[PDB]
Ligand binder design. Structure first.
Ligand code: ZN
Ligand code: ZN
Ligand code: ZN
Lengths: 1189, 130, 100
RNA sequence: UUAUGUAUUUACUGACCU
RNA sequence: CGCUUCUCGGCCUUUUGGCUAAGAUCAAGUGUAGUAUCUGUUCAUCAGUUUAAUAUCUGA
């Protein structure tokens, strides 16, 4: 009814990517666009990884994105053209860590229109003008300059209107301090639409057109206009002026062409196809990426064909005129949307589906071995310059950046018997596809193992000095063993080391330079090179409880309480204070923390008491043993910690069930206890160090790391088991880490991926996985894989054998039948080199039963050549007994544009024995592609496509029992609540259908008024149906309160059904939601609708409890639409009301940017709300804490 | 009652009220009341007094953003091609106000138009599925 | 305006020049022509802001005082993302009244 | 009894207007 | 049974009272763009024009 959007793991697929000196330094940065998201990435050169520095939601679609450098400038400004009618120029302020909007100019109505510009964006390479252009009729030129405050200024938009004109691409022609020119591939179509003969629109070739901006006359003129003997798709800038032969390369199907006007003859170079790659009946070959590079001696282009074959295009010019162009097979990577080759020799590829990559360029130039050919060599008979594909020679993989796009189908399931559920995801397009399992924890990777017998209680990590890294010893105790192991190789039980004292030990630390304190029954040790121990700890009797150590200062207790300090001398040995309080006993824990300065005491004391109380005491010599501020806790703490995590001392108690996080400042203590929960065994809080700073590993039933990642306090769990203890770790075996065991073994751990939320683990697949089901007995995934333009591998083997046949038949007298055999037995990895593409209308498809634990192909069933799967359901029939069945809807000869199926099939399988294999049962035919299978009342329901049929098992084939024919255009989804059917039309909407028991009828009794183009759906109540569409929205259609089902069966109401259902939310997401599921992501949490979109993102829709929460967050985001406008200028209410108007949904991704404004804005909003900004941030993260991650 | 009333000045003033109310409740989930009142605004489309025709046409282009371009396109259809030019041109200028008002949001909202002999009218790309 | 139906707008591309309103018409919106909720500045083309025509009223053509604005109801209808709203012709009012 | 063309008042609209 | 008179009710001028010097005086709106409504007013068979269909022209 009243919902709330939150993104959990925001979108990861990259559409545009640009590079440059956005920070303003010598090093370069990538700015990518995730479509709705705009992100800055730093390619950290020494370690090679990729770190995100900023990610904002622009709330638009970034239709185009391009960086430009102002003339005589250091920093590059980002330039964004979007669905708003706005050009917007951004500057990355590194100090405040945000994108400062420099300018924002309006030029037309909004939304992804045809006439208003924003689709194509070109900039002058010197940085003096910028052209933003539409796909039809109108173009705009802004003139950029700088005024005397070194500040950017924008003229009024110049106009370059040209009626009836398509634009395929636009680009900045480099002219060195000349009038700026822009080149574009146009096409005039008015004679193409006036002549009904059809041939006039068949000989209407493109035109390369050059627009020259007369800065003296302040207007734009068509300078040159030259036709093209093929259709080019996009252009590449050639640098010029003094650097090169100023012009534009033109990529096209099977050609690359240098054109430049005036005097250059048009240079054609046919694109090298592969040797005998088996994807061409008749298909051409285009480029998809440009990736220019200017290596300060020459310039080259890392172009890329549509399979992934990167080419090194180099212009070699003898005159000032061009002479001939030439290229060669550089390398092969997965197919990219955009490339940014980097000075310092990196190559970033952004695969549009699957993972992105960062490569180090190993052998640039590559002018040594390879058979390179050229343009102007007299080669005839088509292409005739081939190349043999090969593995990597020029690049080495450095970083694999992760992405879930495209999430094609998803399940929330708890198959691995863990407490929290898991996300079972289908992902990827093609041979790079993968099933991916996602958990909430962190990447806990074990590097070494030991097997510590008995039952150890605790472990401590200590070094020789404060300056080293080897961490010379590691001590492990339970009651009586000290076992202070050597840390490195041959890790095994120790004799009396240079730091060892006695056997029954209880703590250690480095106190002095090399002076250690180790604590045991007769506690005090002080050992640097000589075992200079002074073991008093006898106030008569008591000798064991509650160590609490820092680096300079100590406070330990005995049975009793507030007691001895036992410090040292800054030039010498230990001493004490004899001022005691002795504190009627009440102690469970103590903890402290020490500051990097301090020629004084320079810490704070926190003690936890057996009674429902903790206590902080400052033990500075003035005001010593005197309590400072008080407490409150419900049951018992059992743990305490003090930490500092930013770039406010973050008091982390923990109680035996829940944990807190206060904000103790050093003179004054304004606590402000953040709360969260952790069976419920007592938690234990251990300060460890990750990434450069420190954090608390608080441990319970499952472990929880609480680290401050850009001041956000990610309290994320760990993927391992319960471990009962933790301590830090450093060695050269693994640089940082955590040694963390009190149970029967020993693990050295690493927390590698540390920024993110989910743990990806991938199980690779052959094709695009449409959807999968879950065998609920003995949990196993049953996946259908299906790809248009793809061979099933029987045809791969037959096509390879046929290739070998004509290679040994085509004039082999003179010979090499070595070529055919070597071709047959050298199989290239299709995940690496791209799958072959089987013309048109071919359809590879398999069916895979897979373990969701290890991810192995427990069963594989191919299909035939054009027989493509589309829908799968496991079920258990009623007329037969317990035994499972698998129903697979298959189509045949589908061809998908223009749509002409040749009728489908439904295969029936048995899924014996435990579900590990899959026996054929029978093959029923059906006259249209059965795209929806749904078990219902011991039978199945099949949407044939306009036809809904009940079915039942026969031993020969499936047997229909009912049929309906009044459901409209095409079925794509069938879901049932029991006695009701929800039929998702592919175009109109949800159609309620009643199934009767006495009869067998299928009576439509309700539909919806809107056309929707529904892609997937999910049931929420007995009445409501939440669905999502192709365009991006999410609707929730609740039936009216009457809608009586009892309708027995000529007019309709509005050419449809009679009880028109009605809509209780509409919301825009910007991505196509493919999986909606009602579930509960955290035990102890609550239900929340989980949508997984197509561009990798994962979000939730969350109901509100009460009207005070609804009204509060409504006024929050209603203030944020005012104070904090989106980046593109796209109005947030009119982005969320893109197709249908928004209804009863509060965009919490605008709300969670309350924590991203400067505190002037935060104080304005919070006092306008009559709260405080920490109170609002508490109230705002309560909802994400409660329902989700 | 005002839009139901005989006098046309009542209908032009109630149409102005429908406009300002339509823009004041936008994005708040009050698309049922406006879809009620649209059923009374919409027969005033054929009035040729200039003040009342500009008042109802401002009310329609103010109801466009409130209840959606889908609902306004549903009311425009089966009358863009109507045999009388008197109804045809008025529904074409209502359609032009919708088309320039929100051109992209109409893409989901167009009907399905089947193929004739020579031409292909089915936008096939929306129709196929994963 | 909406009152005088024969007044025609300029409707060319809106530049960077901010529109101005006379002292007699301060607070008027330019399209819906009301007084409340001003939300968006007026950008007028360079031909309708040249030389003698600078700082001149959008509607009256009198000497401007304050900046011009659109309503919220013109803004959310995106009647500001069309051309420049500089009323060009003076027709059939304040002409015969001058002759009277 | 719908209805026209006009001579023709009377009412009414647009925050119309020095 | 009829006729005249008397009394009660069903009821069709009732305005504040009369007199002065009818006691005495008074009572301004424009211009512009558009509509609605009264009053006045009038309303032989093809062919193509035109219109959603209907109703001018020409034809015998
Ligand atoms: Zn307005
Ligand atoms: Zn103008
Ligand atoms: Zn004015």
């Amino acid at each position: 009814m009243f919902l709330y959007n939150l993104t959990l793991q925001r979108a990861t697929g990259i559409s545009f990517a640009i590079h440059g000196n956005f920070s303003g330094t010598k090093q370069q940065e990538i700015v990518v666009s995730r479509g709705k998201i705009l992100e800055l990435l730093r390619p950290d050169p020494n370690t090679g990884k990729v770190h995100t520095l900023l990610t904002v939601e622009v709330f638009g679609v970034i239709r185009s994105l391009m960086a430009f450098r102002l003339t005589g400038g250091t920093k590059d400004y980002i330039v964004v053209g979007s669905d708003s009618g706005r050009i917007v120029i951004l500057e990355y302020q590194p100090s405040k860590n945000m994108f400062e909007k420099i300018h924002q100019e309006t030029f037309g109505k909004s939304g992804c229109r045809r006439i208003v510009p924003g689709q194509f964006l070109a900039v002058d390479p010197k940085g003096r003008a910028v052209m933003i252009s539409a796909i039809e009729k109108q173009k705009l030129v802004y003139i950029l300059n700088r005024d005397a405050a070194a500040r950017l200024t924008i003229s009024s938009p110049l106009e370059a209107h040209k009626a009836n004109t398509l634009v395929y691409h636009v680009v900045g022609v480099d002219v060195g301090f000349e009038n700026p020119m822009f080149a574009c591939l146009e096409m005039d179509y008015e004679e193409a639409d006036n002549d009904p003969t059809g041939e006039a629109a068949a000989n209407t070739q493109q035109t390369l057109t050059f627009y020259e901006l007369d800065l003296g006359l302040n207007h734009v003129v068509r300078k040159y206009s030259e036709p093209l003997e093929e259709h080019g798709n996009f252009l590449i800038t050639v640098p010029g002026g003094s650097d090169g032969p100023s012009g534009v390369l033109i990529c096209s199907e099977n050609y690359i062409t240098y054109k430049n006007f005036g005097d250059q003859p048009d240079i054609r170079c046919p694109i090298p196809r592969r040797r005998n790659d088996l994807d061409d009946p008749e298909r051409g070959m285009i480029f998809v990426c440009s990736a220019t590079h200017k290596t300060k001696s020459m310039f080259f282009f890392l172009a890329q064909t549509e399979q992934g074959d990167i080419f090194k295009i180099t212009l070699e010019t003898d005159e000032d005129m061009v002479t001939e162009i030439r290229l060669k097979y550089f390398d092969t990577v997965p197919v990219a949307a955009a490339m940014c080759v980097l000075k310092t020799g990196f190559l970033f590829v952004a695969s549009e589906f699957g993972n992105h990559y960062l490569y180090q360029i190993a052998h640039l130039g590559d002018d040594d071995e390879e058979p390179e050919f050229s343009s102007a060599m007299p080669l005839e008979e088509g292409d005739t310059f081939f190349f043999q594909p090969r593995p990597l020679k020029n690049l080495v993989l450095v970083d694999e950046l992760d992405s879930l796009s495209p999430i094609l189908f998803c399940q929330i399931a708890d198959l691995a018997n863990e407490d929290t559920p898991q996300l079972y995801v289908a992902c990827g397009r093609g041979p790079r596809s993968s099933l991916r399992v996602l958990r909430h924890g962190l990447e806990v990777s074990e590097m070494a193992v030991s097997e510590l017998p008995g039952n150890p209680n605790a472990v401590w990590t200590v070094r020789r000095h404060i300056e080293d890294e080897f961490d010379a010893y590691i001590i492990v105790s339970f009651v009586n063993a000290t076992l202070v192991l050597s840390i490195g190789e041959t890790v095994e039980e120790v004799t009396d080391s240079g730091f060892l004292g006695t056997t029954p030990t209880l703590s250690c630390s480095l106190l002095g330079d090399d002076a250690l304190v180790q604590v045991y029954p007769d506690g005090i040790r002080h050992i640097r090179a000589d075992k200079r121990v002074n073991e008093w700890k006898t106030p008569g009797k008591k000798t064991i409880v509650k160590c609490a150590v820092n680096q300079r200062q100590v406070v330990i207790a005995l049975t009793g309480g507030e007691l001895v300090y036992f410090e040292m001398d800054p030039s010498g040995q230990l001493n004490e204070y004899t001022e005691r309080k002795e504190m009627s006993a009440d102690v469970v824990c103590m903890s402290l923390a020490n500051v990097p300065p301090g020629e004084q005491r320079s810490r704070f004391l926190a003690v936890g008491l057996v009674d429902n109380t903790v206590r902080i005491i400052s033990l500075d010599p003035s005001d010593c043993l005197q309590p400072l501020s008080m407490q409150a806790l419900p049951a018992q703490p059992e743990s305490l910690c003090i930490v500092e995590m930013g770039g406010f001392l973050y008091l982390n108690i923990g109680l035996q069930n829940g944990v807190l996080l206060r904000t103790v400042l050093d003179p004054v203590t304004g606590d402000l206890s953040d709360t969260r929960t952790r069976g419920s065994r007592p938690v234990k809080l251990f300060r460890v160090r990750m990434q450069g700073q420190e954090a608390v590993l608080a441990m319970s039933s499952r472990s929880w790391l609480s680290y401050s990642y850009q001041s956000r306090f990610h309290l994320t769990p760990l993927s391992y088991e319960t471990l009962e203890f933790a301590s830090g770790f450093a060695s050269e075996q693994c640089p940082e880490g955590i040694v963390a065991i009190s149970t029967n073994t020993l693990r050295i751990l690493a927390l590698e991926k540390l920024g993110a939320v989910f743990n990806q683990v991938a199980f690779p697949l052959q094709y695009t996985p449409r959807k999968f089901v879950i065998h609920p007995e003995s949990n196993n995934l049953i996946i259908i894989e299906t790809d248009h333009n793809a061979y099933t591998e029987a045809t791969k083997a037959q096509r390879k054998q046929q290739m070998a046949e004509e290679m040994v038949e085509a004039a082999g007298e003179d010979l090499a039948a070595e070529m055919a055999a070597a071709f047959l037995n050298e199989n290239l990895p299709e995940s690496i080199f791209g799958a072959p593409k089987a013309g048109n209308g071919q359809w590879a498809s398999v069916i895979r039963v897979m373990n969701p634990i290890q991810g192995n192909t427990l069963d594989l069933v191919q299909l035939e050549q054009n027989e493509a799967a589309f829908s799968v359901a496991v079920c258990r029939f009623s007329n037969t007994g317990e035994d499972w069945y698998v129903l697979v809807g298959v189509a045949k000869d589908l061809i998908l544009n223009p749509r002409s199926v040749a009728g489908g099939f439904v295969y029936t399988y048995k899924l014996v024995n435990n579900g590990e294999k899959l026996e054929f049962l029978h093959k029923t035919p059906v006259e249209e592609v059965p795209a929806a299978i749904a078990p219902f009342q011991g039978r199945v329901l099949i949407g044939v496509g306009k036809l809904l049929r009940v079915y039942d098992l026969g031993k020969k084939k499936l047997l229909r029992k009912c049929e309906n024919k009044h459901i409209a255009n095409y079925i794509s989804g069938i879901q049932t609540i029991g006695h009701r059917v929800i039929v998702s039309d592919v175009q109109e909407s949800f159609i309620w259908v009643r199934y009767k028991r006495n009869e067998n009828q299928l009576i439509i009794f309700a539909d919806d008024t809107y056309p929707r183009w529904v892609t997937t759906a999910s049931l929420l109540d007995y009445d409501t149906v939440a669905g999502a569409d192709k365009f991006g929205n999410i609707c929730v259609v609740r039936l009216p309160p009457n809608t009586n089902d009892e309708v027995d069966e000529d007019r309709g109401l509005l050419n449809g059904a009679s009880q028109k259902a009605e809509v209780i939310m509409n919301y825009h997401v910007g991505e196509t939601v493919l999986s909606l599921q009602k579930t509960t992501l955290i035990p102890g949490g609550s239900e929340s609708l989980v949508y997984t979109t197509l561009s990798g993102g994962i979000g939730i829709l969350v109901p509100f409890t009460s009207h005070e929460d609804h009204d509060f967050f409504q006024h929050v985001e209603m203030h944020l639409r005012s104070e904090h406008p989106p980046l593109c200028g796209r109005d947030h209410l009119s982005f969320r009301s893109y197709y249908f108007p928004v209804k009863n949904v509060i965009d919490g991704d605008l709300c969670e940017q309350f924590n991203s404004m400067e505190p002037n804005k935060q104080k304005n909003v919070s006092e306008e709300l009559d709260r405080t900004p920490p109170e609002v941030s508490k109230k705002l993260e309560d909802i994400r804490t409660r329902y989700a991650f | 009652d005002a839009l139901m009333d005989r006098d046309l000045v009542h209908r032009q003033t109630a149409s102005a009220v429908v406009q300002h109310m339509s823009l004041g409740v936008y994005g708040f989930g009050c698309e049922d009341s406006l879809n009620h009142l649209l059923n009374y605004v919409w027969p005033n489309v054929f009035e040729t007094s200039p003040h009342v025709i500009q008042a109802v046409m401002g009310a329609l282009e103010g109801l466009r953003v409130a209840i959606g371009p889908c609902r306004m396109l549903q009311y425009c259809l089966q009358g863009l091609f109507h045999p009388a030019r008197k109804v045809r041109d008025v529904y074409w200028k209502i359609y032009n106000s919708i088309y320039i008002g929100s051109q992209d949001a109409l893409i989901a909202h167009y009907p399905r138009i089947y193929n004739d002999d020579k031409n292909t009218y089915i936008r096939y790309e929306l129709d196929y599925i994963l | 305006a909406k009152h005088h139906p024969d007044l025609i707008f300029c409707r060319k591309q809106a530049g960077v020049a901010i529109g101005r309103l006379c002292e007699k018409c301060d607070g008027k919106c330019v399209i819906c022509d009301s007084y409340v909720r001003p939300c968006t500045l007026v950008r007028i083309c360079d031909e309708c802001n040249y030389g003698s025509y600078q700082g001149r009223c959008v509607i009256c053509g009198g000497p401007g005082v304050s900046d011009a604005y659109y309503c919220k109801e013109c803004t959310i209808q995106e009647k500001d993302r069309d051309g420049c709203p500089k009323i060009v012709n003076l027709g059939s009012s304040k002409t015969d009244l001058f002759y009277e």
